[PDB]
Amino acid sequence: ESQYQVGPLLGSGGFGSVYSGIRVSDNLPVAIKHVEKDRISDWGELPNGTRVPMEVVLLKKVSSGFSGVIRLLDWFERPDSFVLILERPEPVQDLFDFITERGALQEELARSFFWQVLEAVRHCHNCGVLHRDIKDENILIDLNRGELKLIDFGSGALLKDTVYTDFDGTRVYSPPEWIRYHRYHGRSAAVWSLGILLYDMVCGDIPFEHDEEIIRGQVFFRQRVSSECQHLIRWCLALRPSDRPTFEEIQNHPWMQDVLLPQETAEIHLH
Numbered sequence: 001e002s003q004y005q006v007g008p009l010l011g012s013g014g015f016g017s018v019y020s021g022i023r024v025s026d027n028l029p030v031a032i033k034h035v036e037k038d039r040i041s042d043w044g045e046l047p048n049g050t051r052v053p054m055e056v057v058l059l060k061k062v063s064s065g066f067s068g069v070i071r072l073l074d075w076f077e078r079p080d081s082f083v084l085i086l087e088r089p090e091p092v093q094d095l096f097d098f099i100t101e102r103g104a105l106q107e108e109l110a111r112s113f114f115w116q117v118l119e120a121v122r123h124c125h126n127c128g129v130l131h132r133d134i135k136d137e138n139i140l141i142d143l144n145r146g147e148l149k150l151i152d153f154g155s156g157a158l159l160k161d162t163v164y165t166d167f168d169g170t171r172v173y174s175p176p177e178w179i180r181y182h183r184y185h186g187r188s189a190a191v192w193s194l195g196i197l198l199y200d201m202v203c204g205d206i207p208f209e210h211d212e213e214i215i216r217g218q219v220f221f222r223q224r225v226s227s228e229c230q231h232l233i234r235w236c237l238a239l240r241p242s243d244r245p246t247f248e249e250i251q252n253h254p255w256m257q258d259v260l261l262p263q264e265t266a267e268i269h270l271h
């Protein structure tokens, strides 16, 4: 309020509105996200009784120096909204706009980005958080350091081992068991979404736009993609949840060997 200087609106949508800002005390870049109270479907509570959106609970759980998930720095409650103060790398482009500009990515670049998103999603699950909205729109690229950040925990949940029967993330990344039965388990649904994301990186667009295509699960490659990379994608997009790989199996797959470091990624592909 007097703590932050507000800059341009960055975007708005299902998630609320997010602005660029600066923390006046040390000129730290921040993003300032406003979430309307009446659009908040899940609430949690802090170890002290305050009632908060569940997004603040999940962000606190994953907050830390490990840079692959966005860090919540502070939050405020107002009469009809909460305001979240998040870290802001700079300069940043989201992965969706990056793909719009470059088209399908060279596999060495897709490998580096996909690897980083797997490390971020493992960090969420280690911290007991299921994101439920992994997609290019929710990944920021720090262009100078080559580091990706997963953002927007607004559709997420606490990770559990039993079935989920509610979902409000992005339908064209959602698995066939959600489309058909309104039921999924968190890790295999996350794996399906990561297969959609990997196809999006290497082909320049998602593979399925319609319920019918998600349920049939046949994947056609519209760009030249190596057999190893097509194997990994088809494995993530296995129709039966228990036929999908674990995160360890994804990261030990032959396609994922010899990944670039984030700095080398920036020097080779982003600079």
Ligand SMILES: N[C@H]1CC[C@H](Nc2cncc(-c3ccc4oc(C(=O)O)cc4c3)n2)CC1
Residues within 6 Å of the ligand: 010, 011, 015, 018, 020, 031, 033, 070, 086, 087, 088, 089, 092, 093, 094, 137, 140, 151, 152, 153
């Ligand atoms: N669709 C685009 C619109 C422009 C936007 N550009 C920029 C530039 N700097 C920081 C940010 C920025 C930084 C942190 C963030 O956290 C969230 C959240 O929901 O957790 C959203 C968000 C956005 N976004 C990226 C997303």
